[PDB]
Amino acid sequence: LECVCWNCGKLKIDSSNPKFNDTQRYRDPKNRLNAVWNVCKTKMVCDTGLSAGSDNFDLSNPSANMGHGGCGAAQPTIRKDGLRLWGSWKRGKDESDLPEKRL
């Protein structure tokens, strides 16, 4: 659940991130899952393939602009409570907004 998007169900990360391929190197399925989850447990938003922060529009190599097609939905923080799972959404940078906690 942490590794997968909450709404579209797609992986939060794609081959775009070099760390993703570094994790993909692993042959054991368990180790691959551990690595991918370790990388993806920080991504709180389903990336839409548009890296915000790079203003250089390189037209020489269009091959590096095809995102997996994410929906941008905010991701929750998942915690274990006995036999239950709790998901806490956090919105924006403002600290006055209480996170939305749902079972």
From Swiss-Prot:
Component of the RNA polymerase II (Pol II) complex consisting of 12 subunits. It is found in: Nucleus. This is DNA-directed RNA polymerase II subunit rpb1. Belongs to the RNA polymerase beta' chain family. DNA-dependent RNA polymerase catalyzes the transcription of DNA into RNA using the four ribonucleoside triphosphates as substrates. Largest and catalytic component of RNA polymerase II which synthesizes mRNA precursors and many functional non-coding RNAs. Forms the polymerase active center together with the second largest subunit. Pol II is the central component of the basal RNA polymerase II transcription machinery. It is composed of mobile elements that move relative to each other. The tandem 7 residues repeats in the C-terminal domain (CTD) can be highly phosphorylated. The phosphorylation activates Pol II. Phosphorylation occurs mainly at residues 'Ser-2' and 'Ser-5' of the heptapeptide repeat. The phosphorylation state is believed to result from the balanced action of site-specific CTD kinases and phosphatase, and a 'CTD code' that specifies the position of Pol II within the transcription cycle has been proposed. The binding of ribonucleoside triphosphate to the RNA polymerase II transcribing complex probably involves a two-step mechanism. The initial binding seems to occur at the entry (E) site and involves a magnesium ion temporarily coordinated by three conserved aspartate residues of the two largest RNA Pol II subunits. The ribonucleoside triphosphate is transferred by a rotation to the nucleotide addition (A) site for pairing with the template DNA. The catalytic A site involves three conserved aspartate residues of the RNA Pol II largest subunit which permanently coordinate a second magnesium ion. The C-terminal domain (CTD) serves as a platform for assembly of factors that regulate transcription initiation, elongation, termination and mRNA processing. Zn(2+) 2 binds at residues 5, 8, 46, 71. The lineage of its organism: Eukaryota, Fungi, Dikarya, Ascomycota, Taphrinomycotina.
